[PDB]
Amino acid sequence: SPEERAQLLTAAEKADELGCPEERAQLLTAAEKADELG
Fold it and tell me: How many domains in the chain?
């Protein structure tokens, strides 16, 4: 899912940049999960 991947992947990057440990775990996995969903 490209649309969701773009939203989730950028969120994952922001989570890293914002330094949120709790959020990054969910966001990083979501970024890759959205890609898995295509």
Answer: 1
Tokens of 31: 């970024």
CB 32 within 8 A of CB 4: no
Distance, CA of 29 to CA of 19 (rounded, Å): 15
Name the experimental technique: NMR
What are 12's two structure tokens? 């994952």
Distance CA(5)–CA(1), nearest Å, equals: 6
Contact 8, 34 (CB under 8 A): yes
Q: How far is CA 25 from CA 20, 21, 30, in A?
A: 9, 6, 8
Range of the domain at 26: 2-37
